[PDB]
Amino acid sequence: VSTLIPPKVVSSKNIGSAPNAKRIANVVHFYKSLPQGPAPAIKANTRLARYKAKYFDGDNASGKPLWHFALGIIAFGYSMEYYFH
Amino acid sequence: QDLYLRELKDTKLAPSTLQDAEGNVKPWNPPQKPNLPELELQGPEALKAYTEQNVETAHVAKESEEGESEPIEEDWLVLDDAEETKESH
């Protein structure tokens, strides 16, 4: 009876579609995300900070700390098993 | 010569009153006048239709209007239906 007009009705149509739900999701997931590894806090300073940078960081993550623990028992020979039970 | 002149004269006696003049017709018992110029004068319009297409009935074209000039109750409904279509589009 006349010229129908569904070419321009997306101003209220862009709310119910599924991609819009993902659209409003990931845009919030993007703006505050740190750009290039910023704010990594690589300078750890808490009590034994030196340990935090050699083995406690996790780059090595090997049996050295338990080796250090074992050597501590060895150095305590005349303190726990000798001169005492 | 005479035999042609007399038949030429004969064309001025028998058919002279037939169509050359209007003295009806002597040999015929039925008359010649109340057939063609009064009964058959309307004969062409006795073959076609009278008082409708011989008068030709110059009729004003029936006027058609727009969509009742009522946009608000349909354009928004069309706009609402446009939403329905574009979800399906």
Curated annotation (Swiss-Prot), chain A:
- Entry keyword set: ATP synthesis, CF(0), Hydrogen ion transport, Ion transport, Membrane, Mitochondrion, Mitochondrion inner membrane, Transit peptide, Transport
Q: What is its main location?
A: mitochondrion
The leader peptide range reads: none
Q: Where in the cell is it found?
A: Mitochondrion; Mitochondrion inner membrane
Domain of life, per UniProt, equals Eukaryota
Q: Which GO terms describe its cellular component?
A: mitochondrial inner membrane; mitochondrion; proton-transporting ATP synthase complex
Q: Name one GO biological process term.
A: proton transmembrane transport
Q: How does it assemble?
A: F-type ATPases have 2 components, CF(1) - the catalytic core - and CF(0) - the membrane proton channel. In yeast, the dimeric form of ATP synthase consists of 17 polypeptides: alpha, beta, gamma, delta, epsilon, 4 (B), 5 (OSCP), 6 (A), 8, 9 (C), d, E (Tim11), f, g, h, i/j and k.
Q: What else is known?
A: Present with 14600 molecules/cell in log phase SD medium.
Known role: Mitochondrial membrane ATP synthase (F(1)F(0) ATP synthase or Complex V) produces ATP from ADP in the presence of a proton gradient across the membrane which is generated by electron transport complexes of the respiratory chain. F-type ATPases consist of two structural domains, F(1) - containing the extramembraneous catalytic core and F(0) - containing the membrane proton channel, linked together by a central stalk and a peripheral stalk. During catalysis, ATP synthesis in the catalytic domain of F(1) is coupled via a rotary mechanism of the central stalk subunits to proton translocation.
Q: Its family?
A: Belongs to the ATPase F chain family.
State what protein this is by name: ATP synthase subunit f, mitochondrial
Organism field: Saccharomyces cerevisiae (strain ATCC 204508 / S288c)
This chain is encoded by the gene named: ATP17
UniProtKB/Swiss-Prot annotation, chain B:
Q: Name one GO cellular component term.
A: mitochondrial inner membrane
The miscellaneous remark of the record is: Present with 6140 molecules/cell in log phase SD medium.
- Acidic residues biased stretches: 65-89
Q: Quote the subunit structure annotation.
A: F-type ATPases have 2 components, CF(1) - the catalytic core - and CF(0) - the membrane proton channel. In yeast, the dimeric form of ATP synthase consists of 17 polypeptides: alpha, beta, gamma, delta, epsilon, 4 (B), 5 (OSCP), 6 (A), 8, 9 (C), d, E (Tim11), f, g, h, i/j and k.
**Role noted for this protein:** Mitochondrial membrane ATP synthase (F(1)F(0) ATP synthase or Complex V) produces ATP from ADP in the presence of a proton gradient across the membrane which is generated by electron transport complexes of the respiratory chain. F-type ATPases consist of two structural domains, F(1) - containing the extramembraneous catalytic core and F(0) - containing the membrane proton channel, linked together by a central stalk and a peripheral stalk. During catalysis, ATP synthesis in the catalytic domain of F(1) is coupled via a rotary mechanism of the central stalk subunits to proton translocation.
The UniProt entry's sequence similarity note says: Belongs to the ATPase h subunit family.
- Region feature Disordered, mapped onto this chain: 54-89
**Which biological process annotations from GO are given for this protein?**
cristae formation; mitochondrial proton-transporting ATP synthase complex assembly; proton motive force-driven ATP synthesis; proton transmembrane transport
Q: Which UniProt keywords apply?
A: ATP synthesis, CF(0), Hydrogen ion transport, Ion transport, Membrane, Mitochondrion, Mitochondrion inner membrane, Transit peptide, Transport
Q: Please state where this protein is localized.
A: Mitochondrion; Mitochondrion inner membrane
Q: What is this protein called?
A: ATP synthase subunit H, mitochondrial
